[PDB]
């Protein structure tokens, strides 16, 4: 009875317009799936299926994305004879871009340029009211980090620190900002910041 698992392709951060597929897996083999928003009345049903061995799972696409998508899903198992469900999955937050006002800028301390096991930094800043702010890394995307904005005027900020930096940090990082009015709605992406290492 134990909960499935959740995952997105290609990620979590979408812009309208684009498509993605929530998949559910489960070492239970569950007949049937479903895919459901939190606090949304509609659901989404898929039968099994076992292209893994040992694994059961469905593959909900989301047709082409708009702010309506924006929200936090669970996917749950169940089976064909039996009344009983599993457990919820953990939940995945479905963000959609260029949603409010305002372009964040992204920035680097000490520098882009880093030594392995370094105090690094990175901040995304706004001019205009952001409450959180995301930081993005190119996909493979799995995250996103998440944080409260601390208003220093005149301008809004988060620091995401990544202090002993790996090789494994090394990318290229986008900033969003977003409102408590709706936080899976973000605003358009700051300048890509390309994090390298040696």
């Given at each position: 009875s134990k909960k499935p698992s959740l995952s997105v392709q290609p990620g979590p951060v979408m812009a309208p317009g684009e498509s993605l597929t929530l998949q559910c897996v489960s070492d239970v083999g569950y007949d049937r799936f479903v895919l459901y928003k939190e606090g949304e009345r509609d659901l989404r049903q898929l039968p099994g299926r076992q292209p893994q061995a040992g694994l059961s799972q469905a593959n909900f696409t989301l047709g082409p994305v708009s702010r309506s998508y924006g929200g936090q899903y669970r996917c749950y198992g169940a089976h064909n004879l039996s009344s009983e469900c599993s457990a919820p999955s953990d939940p995945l937050d479905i963000l959609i871009t260029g949603q409010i006002r305002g372009t964040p800028f992204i920035s680097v301390q000490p520098g882009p340029t880093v030594a392995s096991g370094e105090n690094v930094t990175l901040l995304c800043q706004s001019w205009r009211q952001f409450h959180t702010f995301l930081l993005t890394k190119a996909g493979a995307a799995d995250a996103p980090l998440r944080l409260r904005s601390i208003h220093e005027?005149?301008?809004?900020?988060?620091?995401?620190?990544?202090?002993?930096?790996?090789?494994?940090?090394?990318?290229?990082?986008?900033?969003?900002?977003?409102?408590?009015?709706?936080?899976?709605l973000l605003s358009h992406p700051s300048e890509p910041l390309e994090l390298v290492v040696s």
């Open positions: 005027y005149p301008k809004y900020q988060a620091e995401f620190p990544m202090s002993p930096v790996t090789s494994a940090h090394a990318g290229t990082y986008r900033c969003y900002g977003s409102l408590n009015s709706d936080p899976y």
